[PDB]
Short mmCIF file of C-alpha atoms and ligand atoms in Angstrom, two decimals:
data_model
loop_
_atom_site.label_atom_id
_atom_site.label_comp_id
_atom_site.label_asym_id
_atom_site.label_seq_id
_atom_site.Cartn_x
_atom_site.Cartn_y
_atom_site.Cartn_z
CA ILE A 39 9.66 -40.53 -11.88
CA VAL A 40 7.11 -38.93 -14.22
CA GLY A 41 7.55 -35.30 -15.22
CA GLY A 42 10.78 -34.86 -13.32
CA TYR A 43 14.32 -33.88 -14.30
CA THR A 44 17.78 -35.45 -14.48
CA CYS A 45 19.28 -35.08 -11.00
CA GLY A 46 22.86 -34.94 -12.20
CA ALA A 47 25.58 -37.53 -11.54
CA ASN A 48 25.83 -38.28 -7.81
CA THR A 49 23.80 -35.26 -6.66
CA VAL A 50 21.66 -37.55 -4.47
CA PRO A 51 24.46 -39.40 -2.57
CA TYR A 52 22.09 -41.41 -0.33
CA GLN A 53 20.08 -42.93 -3.20
CA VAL A 54 20.62 -46.66 -3.65
CA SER A 55 19.45 -49.12 -6.27
CA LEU A 56 18.28 -52.59 -5.23
CA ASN A 57 19.48 -55.07 -7.87
CA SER A 58 18.73 -58.72 -8.69
CA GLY A 59 20.04 -58.91 -12.25
CA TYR A 60 18.14 -55.69 -12.90
CA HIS A 61 16.95 -52.61 -10.98
CA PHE A 62 13.70 -53.33 -9.15
CA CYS A 63 13.55 -50.82 -6.29
CA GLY A 64 15.21 -47.81 -4.69
CA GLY A 65 16.40 -47.27 -1.13
CA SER A 66 18.17 -44.83 1.18
CA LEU A 67 21.51 -45.21 2.95
CA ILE A 68 21.09 -44.12 6.58
CA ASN A 69 24.57 -45.10 7.79
CA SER A 70 27.59 -47.08 6.56
CA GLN A 71 25.85 -50.46 6.92
CA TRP A 72 22.11 -49.84 6.71
CA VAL A 73 19.65 -49.05 3.94
CA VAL A 74 15.93 -48.22 4.38
CA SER A 75 13.46 -49.26 1.69
CA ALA A 76 9.88 -50.49 1.27
CA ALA A 77 8.64 -53.78 2.68
CA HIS A 78 6.97 -54.69 -0.60
CA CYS A 79 10.40 -54.50 -2.28
CA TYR A 80 11.59 -57.52 -0.30
CA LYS A 81 13.05 -60.57 -2.05
CA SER A 82 16.11 -62.83 -1.95
CA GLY A 83 19.38 -62.30 -3.80
CA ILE A 84 19.49 -58.55 -3.27
CA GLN A 85 22.62 -56.59 -4.17
CA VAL A 86 22.73 -52.97 -3.04
CA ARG A 87 24.25 -50.61 -5.60
CA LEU A 88 25.55 -47.28 -4.26
CA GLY A 89 27.07 -44.25 -6.00
CA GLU A 90 24.95 -44.97 -9.07
CA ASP A 91 23.86 -42.57 -11.86
CA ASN A 92 23.46 -44.48 -15.15
CA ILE A 93 22.43 -47.92 -13.85
CA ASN A 94 23.41 -49.69 -17.11
CA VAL A 95 27.06 -48.57 -17.42
CA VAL A 96 29.96 -48.80 -14.98
CA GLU A 97 31.10 -45.13 -14.71
CA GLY A 98 33.51 -45.04 -11.77
CA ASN A 99 31.83 -44.36 -8.43
CA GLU A 100 29.75 -47.50 -7.96
CA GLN A 101 29.96 -49.74 -4.92
CA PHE A 102 28.15 -53.09 -5.19
CA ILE A 103 27.46 -54.73 -1.83
CA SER A 104 25.34 -57.76 -1.00
CA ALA A 105 22.60 -57.48 1.59
CA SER A 106 23.46 -59.72 4.54
CA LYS A 107 19.98 -59.41 6.01
CA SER A 108 16.60 -57.86 5.16
CA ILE A 109 14.21 -56.91 7.96
CA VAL A 110 10.61 -56.35 6.90
CA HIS A 111 8.54 -54.58 9.57
CA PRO A 112 6.74 -57.38 11.49
CA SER A 113 3.38 -55.59 11.17
CA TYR A 114 3.59 -55.01 7.43
CA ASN A 115 0.29 -55.90 5.73
CA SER A 116 0.50 -56.57 1.99
CA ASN A 117 -3.26 -56.11 1.60
CA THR A 118 -3.32 -52.57 3.01
CA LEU A 119 0.33 -51.59 2.45
CA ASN A 120 0.41 -50.43 6.06
CA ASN A 121 3.88 -50.31 7.66
CA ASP A 122 5.56 -50.51 4.24
CA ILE A 123 9.13 -50.21 5.45
CA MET A 124 12.14 -52.51 5.47
CA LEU A 125 15.71 -52.34 6.77
CA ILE A 126 18.57 -53.91 4.82
CA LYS A 127 21.95 -54.62 6.40
CA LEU A 128 24.98 -54.58 4.08
CA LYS A 129 27.52 -57.45 4.19
CA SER A 130 30.26 -54.90 4.77
CA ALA A 131 30.20 -51.18 5.46
CA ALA A 132 30.12 -48.89 2.46
CA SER A 133 33.00 -46.50 1.88
CA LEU A 134 31.42 -43.10 2.55
CA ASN A 135 32.58 -40.11 0.54
CA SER A 136 31.29 -37.13 -1.41
CA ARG A 137 29.36 -39.39 -3.81
CA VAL A 138 28.16 -42.00 -1.31
CA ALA A 139 26.66 -40.58 1.88
CA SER A 140 23.90 -41.30 4.39
CA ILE A 141 20.74 -39.27 4.93
CA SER A 142 19.54 -38.24 8.41
CA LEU A 143 16.39 -39.61 10.02
CA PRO A 144 13.79 -37.02 11.06
CA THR A 145 13.45 -35.89 14.68
CA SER A 146 9.90 -34.71 14.01
CA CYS A 147 7.25 -35.18 11.30
CA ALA A 148 6.98 -32.80 8.36
CA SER A 149 3.96 -30.54 7.82
CA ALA A 150 1.69 -30.03 4.80
CA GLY A 151 3.22 -27.75 2.19
CA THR A 152 6.81 -28.78 2.99
CA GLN A 153 8.82 -29.11 -0.23
CA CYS A 154 10.66 -32.42 -0.75
CA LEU A 155 12.95 -34.13 -3.24
CA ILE A 156 11.88 -37.52 -4.57
CA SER A 157 14.17 -39.58 -6.81
CA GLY A 158 14.55 -42.93 -8.55
CA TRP A 159 15.04 -44.94 -11.73
CA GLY A 160 11.36 -45.74 -11.99
CA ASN A 161 9.02 -45.53 -14.95
CA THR A 162 8.87 -42.06 -16.54
CA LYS A 163 5.54 -42.52 -18.38
CA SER A 164 2.02 -42.05 -17.01
CA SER A 165 0.76 -44.09 -19.95
CA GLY A 166 2.98 -47.04 -20.87
CA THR A 167 6.42 -47.97 -19.57
CA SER A 168 9.91 -46.60 -20.25
CA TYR A 169 12.77 -46.60 -17.74
CA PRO A 170 15.70 -44.12 -17.77
CA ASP A 171 19.40 -44.90 -17.51
CA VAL A 172 20.20 -42.01 -15.19
CA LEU A 173 18.68 -40.93 -11.86
CA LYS A 174 15.58 -38.73 -12.08
CA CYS A 175 14.50 -36.05 -9.58
CA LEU A 176 11.22 -34.42 -8.68
CA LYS A 177 10.45 -31.63 -6.19
CA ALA A 178 7.02 -32.17 -4.63
CA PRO A 179 5.06 -30.84 -1.62
CA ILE A 180 3.47 -32.90 1.16
CA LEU A 181 -0.31 -32.57 0.86
CA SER A 182 -2.79 -32.05 3.69
CA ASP A 183 -4.28 -35.18 5.26
CA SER A 184 -7.75 -34.00 4.23
CA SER A 185 -6.76 -33.85 0.56
CA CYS A 186 -4.89 -37.13 0.92
CA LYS A 187 -7.87 -38.97 2.46
CA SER A 188 -10.34 -37.33 0.06
CA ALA A 189 -8.29 -38.76 -2.80
CA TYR A 190 -8.04 -42.22 -1.24
CA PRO A 191 -11.16 -42.81 0.94
CA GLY A 192 -10.51 -45.52 3.52
CA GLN A 193 -7.01 -46.43 2.31
CA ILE A 194 -4.88 -43.91 4.21
CA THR A 195 -3.47 -44.94 7.57
CA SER A 196 -1.58 -42.78 10.06
CA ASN A 197 1.63 -44.27 8.64
CA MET A 198 1.10 -42.77 5.18
CA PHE A 199 1.01 -39.29 3.65
CA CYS A 200 0.35 -37.90 0.19
CA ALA A 201 2.81 -35.78 -1.74
CA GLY A 202 2.66 -34.49 -5.29
CA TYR A 203 0.31 -32.64 -7.62
CA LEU A 204 -3.46 -33.04 -7.89
CA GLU A 205 -3.31 -31.68 -11.44
CA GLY A 206 -1.28 -34.73 -12.46
CA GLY A 207 1.84 -34.68 -14.62
CA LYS A 208 4.45 -35.05 -11.88
CA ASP A 209 4.64 -38.14 -9.69
CA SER A 210 6.74 -41.12 -8.60
CA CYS A 211 6.02 -44.42 -10.35
CA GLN A 212 6.77 -48.17 -10.31
CA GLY A 213 10.52 -48.65 -10.02
CA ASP A 214 10.76 -45.72 -7.62
CA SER A 215 9.25 -47.85 -4.84
CA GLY A 216 11.40 -47.91 -1.72
CA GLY A 217 13.16 -44.70 -2.77
CA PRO A 218 13.62 -41.52 -0.67
CA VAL A 219 11.47 -38.48 -0.01
CA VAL A 220 13.84 -35.96 1.55
CA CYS A 221 12.66 -32.72 3.17
CA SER A 222 15.09 -30.18 4.63
CA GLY A 223 17.87 -32.76 4.86
CA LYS A 224 15.71 -35.41 6.55
CA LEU A 225 14.30 -38.66 5.12
CA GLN A 226 10.59 -38.06 5.72
CA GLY A 227 9.16 -40.66 3.37
CA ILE A 228 9.56 -43.86 1.39
CA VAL A 229 7.98 -44.32 -2.06
CA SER A 230 5.17 -46.80 -1.42
CA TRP A 231 2.11 -46.72 -3.69
CA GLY A 232 -0.47 -44.80 -5.68
CA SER A 233 -3.31 -45.21 -8.15
CA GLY A 234 -1.36 -45.19 -11.38
CA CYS A 235 1.14 -42.38 -11.88
CA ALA A 236 0.85 -38.64 -12.56
CA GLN A 237 -2.92 -39.15 -12.69
CA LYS A 238 -5.23 -36.26 -11.74
CA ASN A 239 -6.43 -36.28 -8.12
CA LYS A 240 -4.34 -39.41 -7.50
CA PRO A 241 -1.14 -38.22 -5.81
CA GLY A 242 1.53 -40.59 -4.54
CA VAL A 243 1.24 -42.19 -1.11
CA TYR A 244 4.36 -42.47 1.05
CA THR A 245 5.49 -44.30 4.17
CA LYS A 246 5.62 -41.81 7.04
CA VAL A 247 9.18 -42.41 8.30
CA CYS A 248 8.88 -40.17 11.37
CA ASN A 249 6.59 -42.79 12.97
CA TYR A 250 9.34 -45.42 12.66
CA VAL A 251 12.44 -43.65 14.01
CA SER A 252 12.38 -45.49 17.33
CA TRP A 253 11.69 -48.83 15.68
CA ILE A 254 14.55 -48.29 13.21
CA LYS A 255 17.08 -47.34 15.88
CA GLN A 256 16.19 -50.17 18.27
CA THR A 257 16.26 -52.66 15.42
CA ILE A 258 19.69 -51.75 14.02
CA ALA A 259 21.01 -51.59 17.59
CA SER A 260 19.89 -55.22 18.04
CA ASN A 261 21.42 -56.43 14.77
C1 M35 B 301 -2.95 -53.99 -3.15
S1 M35 B 301 -4.39 -52.99 -3.56
O1 M35 B 301 -4.30 -52.46 -4.88
O2 M35 B 301 -5.58 -53.73 -3.24
C2 M35 B 301 -4.23 -51.67 -2.37
C3 M35 B 301 -5.06 -51.85 -1.17
C4 M35 B 301 -4.97 -50.91 -0.06
C5 M35 B 301 -4.02 -49.83 -0.19
C6 M35 B 301 -3.19 -49.62 -1.39
C7 M35 B 301 -3.30 -50.54 -2.53
C8 M35 B 301 -2.51 -50.28 -3.79
C9 M35 B 301 -3.12 -49.54 -4.90
C10 M35 B 301 -2.44 -49.30 -6.16
C11 M35 B 301 -1.10 -49.83 -6.32
N1 M35 B 301 -0.42 -49.55 -7.49
C12 M35 B 301 0.71 -48.78 -7.55
O3 M35 B 301 1.18 -48.29 -6.54
C13 M35 B 301 1.35 -48.54 -8.79
C14 M35 B 301 0.92 -49.03 -10.04
C15 M35 B 301 1.85 -48.54 -11.00
C16 M35 B 301 1.76 -48.72 -12.52
F1 M35 B 301 1.53 -49.97 -12.79
F2 M35 B 301 2.89 -48.35 -13.11
F3 M35 B 301 0.77 -47.98 -12.95
N2 M35 B 301 2.77 -47.82 -10.35
N3 M35 B 301 2.48 -47.79 -9.01
C17 M35 B 301 3.19 -46.97 -8.14
C18 M35 B 301 4.49 -47.34 -7.56
C19 M35 B 301 5.24 -46.45 -6.67
C20 M35 B 301 4.68 -45.13 -6.35
C21 M35 B 301 3.38 -44.77 -6.92
C22 M35 B 301 2.77 -43.43 -6.59
N4 M35 B 301 2.48 -42.61 -7.78
C23 M35 B 301 2.63 -45.67 -7.81
C24 M35 B 301 -0.50 -50.59 -5.23
F4 M35 B 301 0.72 -51.09 -5.41
C25 M35 B 301 -1.17 -50.83 -3.96
CA1 CA B 302 26.65 -47.13 -13.10
#
């Protein structure tokens, strides 16, 4: 997160950290056994870390659970980043509490202007790289599709939306990928991609979760 603020220990209870000897992506807990992340975050040997704040120090509320299965959307295209969503099943259910909770799936899509909370342990610099120890937050609005497509001619599909600031300075960045975009208590997006970070006229692009609600539910029901 570039130009954001320190969330505060466990203030984003649904935020998870995907770990493989180091933090490489974020994710969202949608129920006791399932996490939603980005398809391009996929890899083997994934350990899901819940109830995290400072990802480098054991503080007391962490729950480390191995992924028993990772389901990348069958129509995910790595060349266009279309359908950039993945479901991860935990080996055992997580113990839900005040510091570890699930986030609700949307029942309808969000509209332009809607204010959302984006979080992650991603890079905090627009120029160069420097990762934080604690979880970072950023409040950002969903932009109109016109502005989104004007910024990224020919690269925006109906399964993506832009959110952020055209003036630059505040944006999600590498390391935030797979993380949540919550609006009015609903997970509306997944950190996917963007041209650099916090760059002018280059807002972040996010996976439009509302288009995948049926797919998600039918998939977890079958696994
Ligand atoms: C495969 S294509 O290029 O032909 C391509 C083809 C078609 C559609 C989309 C892409 C595409 C473009 C840029 C990127 N690059 C990034 O998305 C990125 C870079 C960095 C850093 F290197 F740090 F500059 N961070 N970063 C990023 C990560 C998460 C969120 C956000 C948001 N602000 C940005 C990417 F992956 C995919
Ligand atoms: Ca920790």
